[PDB]
Design a protein around this ligand. Sequence first.
Ligand code: NA
Lengths: 39, 197
Amino acid sequence: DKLWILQKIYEIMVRLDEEGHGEASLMVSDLIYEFMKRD
Amino acid sequence: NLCPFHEVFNATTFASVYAWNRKRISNCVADYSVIYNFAPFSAFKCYGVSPTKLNDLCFTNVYADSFVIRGNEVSQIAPGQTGNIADYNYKLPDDFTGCVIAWNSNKLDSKPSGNYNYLYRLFRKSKLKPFERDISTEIYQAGNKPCNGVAGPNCYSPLRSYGFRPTYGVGHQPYRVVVLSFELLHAPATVCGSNSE
Ligand code: NA
């Protein structure tokens, strides 16, 4: 449901950062906010 | 005697937005020009008053809130806004009458391997009230299972670092923000514009 995909997004945001993709990480950050605020 | 704005605007480092700093300004004279020219600003919107009008007015107290956010987040520092910063880090009330001032601080706050010292809150159970400051570190519970203060599945730390680097696009570069609030109590106004009385 909602939560599996939330976990994956979180993990890729984290993974993006540790591989030097800070900016991309920040953009996934934004998606988390958007997704959790929602229905 | 003279209001210490220089020390707000020109501080070496700034606060994280989730742990935003507030400086009380009292008992002093204020030319609000030393500010207007401090730096090249990317934002300078006053709501109640205007700068030139400010040089005539006296207040009881002025409060200078300051922090660092991303360029693209600056627009959240306004009344009636929503988003990650307005919802969970720093919230202005709708009837706000002071000034929001922002500028690019890429040169000061960005670092080659990224600046992890500036933080924001990503996860919150509800929106902040105007001028609330939540410095909690409760692990957040996303699912139906309680976290019991343990980080894990559907259980996340609530804060993230910005990791500012000089080569990011400008929207993802750090901006220093100063929010001035102008307080008028029933009391002697000790903070006066430089062309008053
Ligand atoms: Na924006």
